[PDB]
Amino acid sequence: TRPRFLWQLKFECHFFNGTERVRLLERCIYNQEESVRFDSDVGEYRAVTELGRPDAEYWNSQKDLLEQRRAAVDTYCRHNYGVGESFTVQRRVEPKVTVYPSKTQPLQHHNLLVCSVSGFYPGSIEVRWFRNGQEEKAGVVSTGLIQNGDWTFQTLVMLETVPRSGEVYTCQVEHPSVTSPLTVEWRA
Amino acid sequence: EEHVIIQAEFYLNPDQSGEFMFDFDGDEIFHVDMAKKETVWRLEEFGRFASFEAQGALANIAVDKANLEIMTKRSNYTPITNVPPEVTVLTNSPVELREPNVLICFIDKFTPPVVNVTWLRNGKPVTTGVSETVFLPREDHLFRKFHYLPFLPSTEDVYDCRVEHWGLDEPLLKHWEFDA
């Protein structure tokens, strides 16, 4: 199978504070090397590598091509942002929280208690563990956020314990999709 | 910042294959089917609130085919360097025996955007309700992609996501199997 050649083009809009402050950044990427780009805060093209020189100088000439690009920030960015805001920016699916120990073993034996939170969107959430109402900050091993690729996230937050009877463990989840924190206890 | 919306499109030769899509914070919003010439929303629900003219994309790609033939020659025909994938089989939600779930095959950090993913249940290929996503982009100019297999957990089975890529010495198997 012959050699491969890849041309890639990306216009990315980064929104800060909601809509006040947007940055358009147009990148042309040949193979894995970016060659030229348009950065809204610099108003014009700039070759990043030598092969992007011709174009950075070419397009930079067309005072019309540069006239629009600079306005793409509201004609394209702020636009597309207000088009999907209802379903993207304001998407909220609710987290589904579960508490279960891995490795059923006897009490007083080290056990890793797992808090699986899955199905949520947006990715911003907060998971805390409590042992007998007092927050347990240590021995908390997390998988970090995991993006399912279907517009929902998931993450696993484990607490290392040595359960004595009656100790009650709680998992508290805070997510924009909910008013008051989801909690879920586990009895020794 | 807070959110990023990206229109990523590419054209690849010899394959003569391209893609055009929009991405919001890492997830795909939609992408234009080059063949049927129609925009395909990622979650049907999206199509009920917004629209995009699939021809817009076919136009754009036309130029990309072009700029590519251009750029190749000026590079002096330098080809791409294969970066093999970073596969990891995951599960949609905590598996309970006999209760439907979905197995996710996550393929990351690879380039060129060409890869063969097979699902195997007990050593044998499976197409039952399997599906995938187009090549999602990444800041490092490599790609990302997902394959999903809806399944029903039981202690009897074991699976594999079988990934083939040019920067790989041989077909990568990533294994999964319920545990008690």
């Binding site: 083009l9 216009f11 147009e26 011709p54 174009d55 100088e57 070419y58 397009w59 091509l65 793409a72 004609t75 394209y76 636009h79 597309n80 207000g82 088009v83 999907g84 | 229109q7 499109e9 929009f22 919003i29 939609f30 609130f49 917004a50 629209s51 995009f52 003219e53 817009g56 994309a57 136009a59 754009n60 130029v63 990309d64 072009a66 700029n67 251009i70 750029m71």
Partner: peptide
């Protein structure tokens, strides 16, 4: 609403 795409500029020859 309509998603507004951005067009690709042809390279320098």
């Amino acid at each position: 609403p309509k998603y507004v795409k951005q067009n690709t500029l042809k390279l320098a020859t």
